Amino acid sequence: AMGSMERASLIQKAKLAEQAERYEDMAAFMKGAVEKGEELSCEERNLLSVAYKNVVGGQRAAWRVLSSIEQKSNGPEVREYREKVETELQGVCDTVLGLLDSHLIKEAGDAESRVFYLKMKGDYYRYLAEVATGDDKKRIIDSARSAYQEAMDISKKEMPPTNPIRLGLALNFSVFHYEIANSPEEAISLAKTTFDEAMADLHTLSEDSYKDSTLIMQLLRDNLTLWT
Amino acid sequence: AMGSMERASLIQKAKLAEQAERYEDMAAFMKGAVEKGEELSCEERNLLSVAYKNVVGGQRAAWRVLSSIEQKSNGPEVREYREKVETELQGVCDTVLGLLDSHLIKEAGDAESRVFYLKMKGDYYRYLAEVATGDDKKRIIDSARSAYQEAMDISKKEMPPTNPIRLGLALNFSVFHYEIANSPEEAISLAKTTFDEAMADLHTLSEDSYKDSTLIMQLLRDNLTLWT
Numbered sequence: 001a002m003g004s005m006e007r008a009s010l011i012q013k014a015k016l017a018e019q020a021e022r023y024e025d026m027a028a029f030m031k032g033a034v035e036k037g038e039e040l041s042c043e044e045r046n047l048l049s050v051a052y053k054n055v056v057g058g059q060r061a062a063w064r065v066l067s068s069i070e071q072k073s074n075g076p077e078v079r080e081y082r083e084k085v086e087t088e089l090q091g092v093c094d095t096v097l098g099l100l101d102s103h104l105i106k107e108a109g110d111a112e113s114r115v116f117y118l119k120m121k122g123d124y125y126r127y128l129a130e131v132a133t134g135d136d137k138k139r140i141i142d143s144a145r146s147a148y149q150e151a152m153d154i155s156k157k158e159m160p161p162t163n164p165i166r167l168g169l170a171l172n173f174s175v176f177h178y179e180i181a182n183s184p185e186e187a188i189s190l191a192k193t194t195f196d197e198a199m200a201d202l203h204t205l206s207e208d209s210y211k212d213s214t215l216i217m218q219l220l221r222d223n224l225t226l227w228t
Numbered sequence: 229a230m231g232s233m234e235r236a237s238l239i240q241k242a243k244l245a246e247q248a249e250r251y252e253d254m255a256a257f258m259k260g261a262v263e264k265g266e267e268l269s270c271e272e273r274n275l276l277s278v279a280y281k282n283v284v285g286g287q288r289a290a291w292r293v294l295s296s297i298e299q300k301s302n303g304p305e306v307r308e309y310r311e312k313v314e315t316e317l318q319g320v321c322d323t324v325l326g327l328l329d330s331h332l333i334k335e336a337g338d339a340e341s342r343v344f345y346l347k348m349k350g351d352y353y354r355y356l357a358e359v360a361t362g363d364d365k366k367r368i369i370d371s372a373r374s375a376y377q378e379a380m381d382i383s384k385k386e387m388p389p390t391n392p393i394r395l396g397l398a399l400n401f402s403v404f405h406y407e408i409a410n411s412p413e414e415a416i417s418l419a420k421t422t423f424d425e426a427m428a429d430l431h432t433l434s435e436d437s438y439k440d441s442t443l444i445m446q447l448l449r450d451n452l453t454l455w456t
């Protein structure tokens with residue numbers, strides 16, 4: 001549907017939609033931009049991530065409300081409506097995963113792009129895992145793990161320990177361990193090592209970089225406080 | 229699209245969607261319920277109102293953000309995107325107005341239903357007026373006025389001055405005077421007379437009715453403080 005709109009116009013409208021808090025529109029504009037086939041800049045990758053994080057975040061919040069009501073109930077209506085929301089959420093995750101697979105990850109050669117997109121791949125498989133059951137659940141969990149692991153391997157080789165993309169990936173992979181993989185020890189170990197290694201590298205940063213890094217370190221700290 | 233779902237199931241799902249903050253779904257469920265052709269109870273009228281108030285409220289907020297950006301700008305992109313949001317907002321108002329006209333108002337014989345639906349008709353024409361220009365704007369403004377006026381005439385004859393539906397109608401009609409009709413004196417006069425007449429009738433109310441009435445009186449007071 002965005003085929004006829006200029007790439008630059010799609011990006012401008014994504015930024016307008018963000019200002020207007022119209023995240024579904026923002027996601028559709030950014031999907032349109034990705035579908036132009038050109039690589040995305042740092043700023044554009046962030047718009048893509050913000051758009052979809054907000055759309056799926058609304059769906060996750062609703063799915064949690066409905067799943068809780070359903071669990072307390074256990075007519076077909078609560079299950080039906082939870083399934084409707086679930087299917088829409090799965091559709092959004094599949095769309096994002098589709099964009100990463102066609103062809104963002106394949107064309108991403110710099111560490112900052114490649115780690116960003118692999119982290120996104122991990123996150124959206126993780127959101128699929130949250131609603132999955134049984135064996136289905138196992139292959140989705142391993143897809144999330146695999147994407148996070150490749151992202152981590154590159155991040156550790158190519159980025160300093162205070163790099164915000166590296167920090168956010170480790171944060172999210174630790175949440176995956178705690179919430180999805182039933183590995184709270186791995187979660188705590190990862191968050192603590194990441195935090196400690198970032199602390200030791202802060203002395204190399206400017207005021208503004210220090211601010212960006214320490215903000216994410218505080219999230220690692222918040223989790224560690226929740227988990228210990 | 230809701231033709232195949234039971235009326236009772238649509239109402240149950242509207243309530244679930246409200247809990248999940250899924251207002252677009254809530255509105256679609258309630259549109260489905262209205263389209264069953266049966267009158268709506270007090271509780272169901274409130275679900276219909278809440279659903280659409282939230283959907284149009286999001287669109288109004290976005291339209292205001294974009295209109296402000298557009299005014300500061302004065303490429304085609306801001307205007308295009310403001311028009312897109314505007315058209316969607318107009319679509320929602322036209323849908324609500326359509327439900328009231330087919331056939332909620334015509335079948336509504338009790339004061340509490342008839343005033344409720346005429347107030348809604350005033351409100352949705354008012355939202356259309358907010359984005360309208362020129363002469364177009366004049367016929368829409370008079371449609372809002374006419375609906376509010378019929379609602380007021382019934383409310384004054386049939387309801388006590390503390391009735392929350394009567395109070396909310398007067399509040400909204402005063403906002404129409406202030407914001408749409410360029411009649412701030414009429415706005416202030418209406419809010420003040422409504423407030424004073426409700427005050428004098430509070431002595432007749434139970435604790436819970438007193439709470440409901442005084443909450444809306446506080447909104448009239450808030451406006452009077454804003455306007456004077």
Ligand SMILES: O=C(COc1ccccc1P(=O)(O)O)Nc1cc(C(F)(F)F)ccc1Cl
Binds near residue numbers: 175
């Ligand atoms: O509240 C959270 C917290 O979850 C995290 C904490 C630390 C790292 C990663 C996550 P997330 O599970 O990727 O969102 N997530 C969340 C966010 C939204 C929002 F804000 F994007 F709309 C909505 C729903 C949820 Cl669960």
Ligand SMILES: O=C(COc1ccccc1P(=O)(O)O)Nc1cc(C(F)(F)F)ccc1Cl
Binds near residue numbers: 282285403
């Ligand atoms: O903030 C307001 C205040 O406007 C009023 C104040 C007193 C009476 C009636 C109105 P309204 O213009 O019918 O919403 N309206 C508004 C509400 C939403 C919400 F909360 F429904 F999402 C969104 C946008 C607006 Cl402008």
Ligand SMILES: [Cl-]
Binds near residue numbers: 080081084241
């Ligand atoms: Cl459903």
Ligand SMILES: [Cl-]
Binds near residue numbers: 106107108109
């Ligand atoms: Cl490459």
Ligand SMILES: [Cl-]
Binds near residue numbers: 013308
């Ligand atoms: Cl547009």
Ligand SMILES: [Cl-]
Binds near residue numbers: 334335336337
């Ligand atoms: Cl009648």
Ligand SMILES: [Mg+2]
Binds near residue numbers: 006007
């Ligand atoms: Mg071009």
Ligand SMILES: [Mg+2]
Binds near residue numbers: 077
């Ligand atoms: Mg039931």
Ligand SMILES: [Mg+2]
Binds near residue numbers: 086
């Ligand atoms: Mg399912």
Ligand SMILES: [Mg+2]
Binds near residue numbers: 111158159160
């Ligand atoms: Mg490097």
Ligand SMILES: [Mg+2]
Binds near residue numbers: 185
């Ligand atoms: Mg231990």
Ligand SMILES: [Mg+2]
Binds near residue numbers: 234235
């Ligand atoms: Mg039936």
Ligand SMILES: [Mg+2]
Binds near residue numbers: 012303304305
């Ligand atoms: Mg331009």
Ligand SMILES: [Mg+2]
Binds near residue numbers: 311314315
């Ligand atoms: Mg227009």
Ligand SMILES: [Mg+2]
Binds near residue numbers: 339386387388
């Ligand atoms: Mg009466």
Ligand SMILES: [Mg+2]
Binds near residue numbers: 413
């Ligand atoms: Mg005067």
